[PDB]
Amino acid sequence: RFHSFSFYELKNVTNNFDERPISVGGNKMGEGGFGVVYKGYVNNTTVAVKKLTTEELKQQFDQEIKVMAKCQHENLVELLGFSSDGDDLCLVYVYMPNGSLLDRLSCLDGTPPLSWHMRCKIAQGAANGINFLHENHHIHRDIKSANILLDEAFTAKISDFGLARASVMTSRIVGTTAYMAPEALRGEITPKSDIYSFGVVLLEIITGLPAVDEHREPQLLLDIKEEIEDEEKTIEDYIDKKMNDADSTSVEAMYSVASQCLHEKKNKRPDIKKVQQLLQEMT
Numbered sequence: 001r002f003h004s005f006s007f008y009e010l011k012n013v014t015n016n017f018d019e020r021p022i023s024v025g026g027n028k029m030g031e032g033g034f035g036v037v038y039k040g041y042v043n044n045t046t047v048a049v050k051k052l053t054t055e056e057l058k059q060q061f062d063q064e065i066k067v068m069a070k071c072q073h074e075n076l077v078e079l080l081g082f083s084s085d086g087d088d089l090c091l092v093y094v095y096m097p098n099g100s101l102l103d104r105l106s107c108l109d110g111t112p113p114l115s116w117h118m119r120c121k122i123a124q125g126a127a128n129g130i131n132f133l134h135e136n137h138h139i140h141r142d143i144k145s146a147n148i149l150l151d152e153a154f155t156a157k158i159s160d161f162g163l164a165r166a167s168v169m170t171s172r173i174v175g176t177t178a179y180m181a182p183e184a185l186r187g188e189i190t191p192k193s194d195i196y197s198f199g200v201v202l203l204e205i206i207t208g209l210p211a212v213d214e215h216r217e218p219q220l221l222l223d224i225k226e227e228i229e230d231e232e233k234t235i236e237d238y239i240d241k242k243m244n245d246a247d248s249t250s251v252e253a254m255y256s257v258a259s260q261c262l263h264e265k266k267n268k269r270p271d272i273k274k275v276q277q278l279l280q281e282m283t
């Protein structure tokens with residue numbers, strides 16, 4: 001039971017959708033690729049209002065709402081309402097004060113680096129969210145650090161279910177290439193591909209490096225697995241130098257999970273329940 005807003009009500013919430021930089025007194029918070037996300041106030045509740053071909057975008061809008069109606073969990077973003085009355089699409093969520101894991105890993109706008117302790121809890125939280133989705137027979141298809149949000153306590157919240165499928169190959173290959181498993185690039189749809197993408201997220205957590213950097217060797221973060229396997233680099237060479245509380249044993253444990261997640265044969269990867277347990281044993 002979501003609150004069916006009119007589009008006009010959401011204009012009064014968002015100051016008729018004002019533009020950019022929130023770090024210097026603005027209201028627009030960010031963009032993923034499907035919509036622009038605005039900060040607003042419904043009574044005293046802080047909200048995030050996402051303003052989104054038409055048929056494909058309308059299908060993602062309906063799929064977001066359908067997934068959110070079925071799936072409530074502390075490690076999933078909470079949808080408060082929607083509006084689709086006058087040929088315009090909006091999604092209103094509970095506000096996440098600490099933004100995305102990507103933003104916090106990059107220390108965007110002067111935020112302090114995440115500690116190893118906090119990074120372990122974020123990894124666990126994200127895995128619990130993905131487990132819930134998979135337990136409810138949903139494939140996310142776009143797991144990445146930009147889609148893991150963080151509340152006031154840095155609890156991880158999986159977001160953006162527009163591309164999700166309630167589980168075969170597909171014609172239209174979707175996802176972010178730096179996170180995608182080989183079989184996903186070939187066009188397969190499977191929960192095993194979400195596991196692979198989570199492996200890339202775990203590498204971002206360990207290293208603080210972006211998943212892709214055109215100005216680096218190797219350009220794709222997933223390729224450090226091969227460097228470490230061939231012993232031309234070590235895990236210690238890549239560990240984020242913006243932490244001071246990272247013990248070798250637990251970092252090695254998380255890397256072992258990331259390595260298993262990034263197995264190139266899909267059927268050799270752990271399922272999400274095993275990933276959850278391995279991260280639980282790490283802590």
Ligand SMILES: CC1(C)Cc2cc(NC(=O)c3cnn4cccnc34)c(N3CCOCC3)cc2O1
Binds near residue numbers: 047094097
């Ligand atoms: C000002 C702060 C520091 C607080 C804050 C919150 C959110 N997001 C949300 O509050 C939010 C809640 N549900 N939701 C759903 C989709 C996108 N964003 C959200 C985002 N996002 C913008 C879009 O890209 C992802 C990060 C950035 C951000 O920076």
